């Protein structure tokens, strides 16, 4: 009952001992019970009988058992999934190992038991039946490993008995004879065991590590790894290493993984081997190349091995080898990054920490792959967590007595450590909370807050002139537990911050710096904290200055004055930038600056010459004035004025949509798509009374204006830069579609590009199609056909009515037509699709020969008849015959589109 006992069972040693029990009683019935076990473990349902055992050779048994296999599927026990089969496999392996180990002193040498088992496994491992070849190979591999243990024990026993002999050769002659006899008997035992291993190795391993099946190659390499780690004195030489050397070049990841796991076992925990280092130096090149293996799981192990190789020597590796591994700290995949990061640590990381902090800066500065530290830092997070949270140390180097390229980089690194400590997740793309982690977090914030509440004002003071450094330092307060400004009695420092921020705003015109200032002032102006009122005063005061400066500049600027020149403009722009950035994050309605901005946008139209950058920022600025007034909405005198400004602003954005300046068109376009969605029909939707007066629906003129822009500016022919802008514009328009601010028929000009622009815009167009299917199954499929219609008429205008249906243009529409079909209330749609395709096919008649025309559309329309539907097919045909006539139906020769469409119905 062996097979069933091993899967269903009870301890393994219990059934092995029970088996050894029976083998003593009757060898032959027990060996037969053993034969069958190995067979039945392969999924076979046959049985080897006593008569077969006594008489047939293995080749004949295996044949009979292939016949009697009686399988349902191609499944066999070692390939079925689930825990009960994982437990089987381990039970299967435990039993073989425990059987041999329990026989190693008597039975194993009886000339009967092992030759039988080995002969069978050698034959089964030769079978073309995979279930036999797979199972028997695993068996023989476990069997071999059990024998390496026996050999090892023997060697140990041989050495002890040898020491016993020599101690007596010193010193009697009767015991000497017994020790000589014992030593003789053990040497025989060693020879016998080496035979058995050599049978299995040359009979199975040498053929089967090379099997066509990858799972079988992996089995063989796993155990050769085990033999060398287990009895290294006997197996850790080139004559066994070479197999793992070759198999490192295997075409499957799972095989290559095992070669690296095997070698790792030969370094961890213990060293050191001259023969191993020779092999490694001989295969070093191929190892470092595997740090970029196609399979990530393989790449990690390759780095981890290289980390172990580091411990032994560091002699074998070169600068270029190590430099290559360093690059991987910037890998997209975290396990690789972290593994490469641990390698980096042990290689180059050994004012106690100040030299390690400075070290990290040099590494980061020598990296020509990344311009920010978010990913370098995350890779180091697991191992150098102490170095990276040393903010007191990092803060000291920036202040108190090197080069300004190093100062910016240290600020960069510092901010990354802080963010990743503050918020507890890795940076984007590195992701995939516990009790003790939130503790460290809370510890981290208070340490950051307490240190940088005091240090940041000094830090801004020192580095205020540098835009890159300031943009970084300003991100800090967004990570504070702000309570500490009160309870820590630190309000003197807070005022210093608000002073340094204010000074920065006024000396800087760089867009990012001002964004940082604004976003920061917003973080501090949280009204769940005692601190709000202090900051609100400074906010309310900084902006009083900006508005007044802005009004006065706008006085000299609008009149004739002089000129206004390039210089008078940069004056306005600079001040306008500061105002716009703040109006985004902060409600500045208490300053009615629609007036100043409207006066600046309308004056730009009439004069026709207004510097791009001013126009852009006004457009942005008044967008925020409008939106903020809509935020605080009782009264109804304010409510009527909001629509005033809004309706007007939409007209201005519409005029600038045809502005000769391209980045200006785009600015006007994106603001437009924003307001249209905001003041859409959906404004009143959320339990809104007073929001039904503000609703805006664009003119049919504007609807086409917005489309003309997309076609010109999204659909033509670094550059990852340019694309991101265009996807953003497209989604801005598609939102108007899927939320029906704009007619769905506009999507026809967009759906037809799903293919021609499938990598740039595929997923955005694919979602627009879905959000119209889920919204209205019917008119989706309508405009969807109008797309293929529009592609069709384009082919005509460019070639005429001769097509050449074999052409690439025509074949292209058919291909898009098939992919549209897979997008299929449930069946009233395809009905509606074929109807319009038929209507369109017979839209225009032919003047002569014969009184054709537009008829070729049916070979495209034929791509949809596949989908639906027998009952509805009659209905379609009935609708088709309203158009086609008898002498049309009857002649077949060119008129092929119509016939082809008909076969499918």
């Amino acid at each position: 009952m062996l097979f069933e006992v091993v899967k269903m069972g009870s301890a393994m040693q219990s059934v092995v001992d029970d088996w050894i029990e029976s083998y003593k009683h009757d060898r032959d019935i027990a060996l037969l019970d053993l034969i069958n076990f190995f067979i039945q473990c392969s999924g076979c349902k046959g049985v080897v009988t006593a008569e077969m055992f006594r008489h047939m050779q293995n080749s004949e048994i295996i044949r009979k058992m292939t016949e009697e296999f009686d399988e349902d599927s191609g499944d066999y026990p070692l390939t079925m999934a689930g825990p009960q089969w994982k437990k089987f496999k381990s039970s299967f392996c435990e039993f073989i190992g425990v059987l041999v180990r329990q026989c190693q002193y008597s039975i194993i040498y009886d000339e009967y038991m092992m030759d039988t088992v080995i002969s069978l496994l050698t034959g089964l491992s030769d079978s073309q039946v995979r279930a036999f070849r797979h199972t028997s190979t695993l068996a023989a591999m476990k069997l071999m490993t059990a024998l390496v243990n026996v050999a090892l024990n023997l060697s140990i026993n041989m050495d002890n008995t040898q020491r016993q002999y020599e101690a007596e050769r010193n010193k009697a002659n009767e015991r000497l004879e017994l020790l000589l006899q014992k030593r003789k008997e053990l040497q025989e035992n060693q020879d016998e065991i080496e035979n058995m291993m050599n049978a299995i190795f040359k009979g199975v391993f040498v053929h089967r590590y090379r099997d066509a099946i990858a799972e079988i190659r992996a089995i063989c390499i796993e155990e050769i790894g085990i033999w060398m780690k287990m009895y290294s004195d006997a197996f850790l030489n080139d004559s066994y290493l070479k197999y793992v050397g070759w198999t490192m070049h295997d075409k499957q990841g799972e095989v290559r993984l095992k070669c690296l796991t095997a070698l790792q076992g030969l370094y961890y925990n213990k060293e050191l081997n001259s023969k191993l280092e020779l092999f490694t130096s001989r295969f070093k090149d191929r190892i470092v190349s595997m740090t970029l293996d196609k399979e990530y799981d393989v790449a990690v192990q390759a780095i981890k091995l290289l980390t172990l190789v580091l411990q032994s020597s560091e002699e074998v590796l070169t600068a270029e080898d190590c430099e290559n591994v360093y690059h991987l700290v910037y890998s997209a995949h975290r396990p690789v990054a972290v593994a490469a990061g641990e390698f980096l640590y042990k290689k180059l990381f050994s004012g106690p920490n100040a030299n390690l902090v400075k070290t990290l800066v040099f590494f980061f500065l020598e990296s020509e792959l990344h311009e920010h530290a978010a990913y370098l830092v995350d890779s180091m997070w697991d191992c150098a967590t102490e170095l990276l949270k040393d903010w007191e140390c990092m803060n000291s180097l920036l202040l108190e007595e090197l080069t300004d390229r190093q100062e910016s980089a240290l600020i960069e690194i510092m901010l990354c450590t802080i963010r990743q400590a503050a918020e507890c997740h890795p940076p984007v793309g590195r992701g995939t909370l516990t009790a003790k982690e939130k503790k460290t977090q809370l510890d981290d914030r208070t340490k950051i807050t307490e240190l940088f509440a005091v240090a940041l004002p000094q830090l801004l003071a020192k580095y205020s002139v540098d835009a890159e450094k300031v943009t970084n330092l300003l991100q800090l307060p967004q990570y504070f537990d702000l309570e500490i400004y009160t309870t820590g009695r630190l309000e003197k420092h807070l005022d210093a911050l608000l002073r340094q921020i204010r000074n920065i705003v006024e000396k800087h015109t760089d867009t990012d710096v001002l964004e940082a200032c604004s976003k920061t002032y917003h973080a501090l102006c949280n009204e769940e904290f005692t601190i709000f009122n202090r900051v609100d005063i400074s906010r309310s005061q900084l902006i009083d200055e900006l508005a007044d400066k802005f009004n006065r500049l706008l006085e000299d600027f609008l009149q004739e004055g002089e000129e206004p020149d390039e210089d008078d403009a940069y004056q306005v722009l600079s001040t306008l930038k500061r105002i716009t950035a703040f109006h985004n994050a902060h409600d500045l309605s208490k300053w009615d600056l629609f007036a100043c901005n409207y006066k600046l946008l309308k004056t730009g139209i009439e004069n026709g010459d207004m510097p791009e950058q001013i126009v852009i920022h006004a457009l942005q600025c008044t967008h925020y004035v409008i939106l903020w007034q809509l935020a605080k909405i009782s009264t109804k005198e304010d409510l009527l004025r909001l629509k005033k400004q809004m309706r007007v602003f939409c007209q201005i954005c519409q005029h600038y949509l045809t502005n000769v300046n391209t980045t200006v068109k785009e600015q006007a376009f994106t603001i437009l798509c924003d307001i249209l969605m905001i003041f859409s029909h959906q404004i009143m939707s959320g339990g809104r009374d007073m929001l039904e007066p503000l609703v805006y629906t664009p003119d049919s003129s504007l609807q086409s204006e917005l489309l003309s822009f997309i076609l010109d500016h999204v659909f033509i022919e670094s550059k990852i830069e340019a694309l991101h802008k265009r996807r953003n514009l497209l989604a801005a328009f598609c939102k108007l579609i899927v939320y029906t601010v704009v007619e769905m028929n506009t999507a026809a000009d967009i759906f037809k590009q799903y293919m021609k622009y499938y990598n740039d815009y595929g997923d955005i167009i694919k979602e627009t199609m879905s959000k119209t299917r889920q919204i209205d199954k019917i008119q989706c499929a309508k405009t969807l056909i109008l797309s293929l219609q529009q592609l069709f008429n384009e082919m005509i205008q460019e070639n005429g009515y001769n097509f050449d249906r074999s052409s690439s243009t025509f074949s292209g529409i058919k291909e898009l037509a098939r992919r549209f079909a897979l997008t299929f209330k449930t069946r009233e749609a395809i009905a509606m699709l074929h109807k319009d395709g038929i209507e369109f096919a017979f839209k225009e008649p032919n003047p002569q020969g014969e009184s054709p025309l537009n008829l070729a559309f049916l070979d495209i329309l034929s791509e949809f008849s596949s989908k639906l539907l027998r009952q509805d097919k009659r209905t379609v045909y009935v609708y088709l015959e309203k158009f086609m006539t008898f002498q049309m139906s009857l002649r077949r020769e060119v008129w092929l589109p119509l016939m082809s469409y008909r076969n499918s119905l």
Binding site: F69, D211, A631, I678, A731
Partner: protein
């Protein structure tokens, strides 16, 4: 016809192993980087069809204003 899996070819021949050592360019690749700049890092965070259809085209830094947009996001 038997559902039993029988292999016509059981072993990779010695010559193809020799070839595997000679050329592994098809099981090796180029380094795939994470976002190499702050701008590109922010893009990856805020990119994809999901995020794009659920945010303004002109970014709004205040949630008071962002809600005015996201308020209108189901037909």
């Amino acid at each position: 016809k038997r559902k039993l899996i029988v292999d016509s070819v059981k072993e990779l021949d010695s010559k193809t192993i020799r070839a595997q050592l000679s050329d592994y360019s098809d099981i090796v690749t180029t380094l795939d980087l994470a976002p190499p700049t702050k701008k590109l890092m922010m893009w990856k965070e805020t990119g994809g069809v999901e995020k794009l259809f659920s945010l303004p085209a002109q970014p709004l830094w205040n949630n008071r204003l962002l809600k005015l947009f996201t308020r209108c996001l189901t037909p």
